[PDB]
């Protein structure tokens, strides 16, 4: 997370950490939407251009973490995966169109002060809130900077990072990149003449883009961190998977079996 700030304890109870069995590594963020279902980005699990192909087997899942590095004894829960469901039409070949996957845990989890699911938006809620200039929030344990080049400062946070970013007018989004954009996407962050900065980065995918309802003082997952070009660059914006456009498949996989 670029230019964010240390998250408060229990501030983002659905935050999930995708973790590699060996080598032990943080792969992505993810979120809790039930005590059995987890939502992330598909490129987190499968990205052939880079030799990426993780099976249920290769990973762990950590719910309740704050510290990135340290094992929080009676707070965190390490779960194993039963299944992985990737959108049949996720386009890894070109623009990462439909960058979504679902993970159902081996056994349910029990909610606590640090473990609590987030809502998925309804028709009403999507529409009411997915307005340009409306601010959402991002959380992660990803890169504090563009790490593939020589830089000063630490490259990764010790604790959960949080950033609050405005939604941008598609046209702005559209014109900001040579990458083919789609209805399943939305770009967010500040404009070079706003004076505020911030963005998500490498290691942030799968993390939620959440919004609070003025209507029911409830948090909803509107986006999934997806892709971007560098991090916190002027005249560029981060791209997030459009959760509302994807609910249909979402619900379909979630309710299949009883």
């Amino acid at each position: 997370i670029v230019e964010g700030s240390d998250a408060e304890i229990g501030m983002s109870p659905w935050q999930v950490m995708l973790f590699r069995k060996s080598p032990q590594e943080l792969l992505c963020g993810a979120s809790l939407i039930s005590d059995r279902w987890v939502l992330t980005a598909a490129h987190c699990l499968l990205y052939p251009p880079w030799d990426k192909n993780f099976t249920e087997n290769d990973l762990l899942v950590r719910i309740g973490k704050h510290s990135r590095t340290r094992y929080e004894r009676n707070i965190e829960k390490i779960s194993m995966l039963e299944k992985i469901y990737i959108h049949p039409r996720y386009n890894w070949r070109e623009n990462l169109d439909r960058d979504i996957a679902l993970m159902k845990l081996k056994k349910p989890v029990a909610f606590s002060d640090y473990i609590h699911p987030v809502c998925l938006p309804d028709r009403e809620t999507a529409a009411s809130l997915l307005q340009a200039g409306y601010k959402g929030r991002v959380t992660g344990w990803g890169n504090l900077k563009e790490t593939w080049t020589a830089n000063v400062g630490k490259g990764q946070p010790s604790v959960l990072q949080v950033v609050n970013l405005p939604i941008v007018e598609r046209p702005v989004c559209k014109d900001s990149t040579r990458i083919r954009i789609t209805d399943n996407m939305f770009c967010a962050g500040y404009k070079p003449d706003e004076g505020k900065r911030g963005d998500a980065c490498e290691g942030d995918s799968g993390g939620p883009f959440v919004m609070k309802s003025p209507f029911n003082n409830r948090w909803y997952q509107m986006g999934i961190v997806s892709w971007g070009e560098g991090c916190d660059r002027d005249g560029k914006y981060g791209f997030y998977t459009h959760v509302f456009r994807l609910k249909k498949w979402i619900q379909k996989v979630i309710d299949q079996f009883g």
Binding site: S5, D113, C119, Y134, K135, N217
Partner: peptide
């Protein structure tokens, strides 16, 4: 069905240090 309400915050009728910002952008 209990989703999006935080124990240490909404469960507590408490607020996070920067959620107003968000509430303030929603026209």
């Amino acid at each position: 069905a209990d989703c999006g309400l935080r124990p240490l915050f909404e469960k507590k009728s408490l607020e996070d240090k920067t959620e107003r910002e968000l509430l303030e952008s929603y026209i």
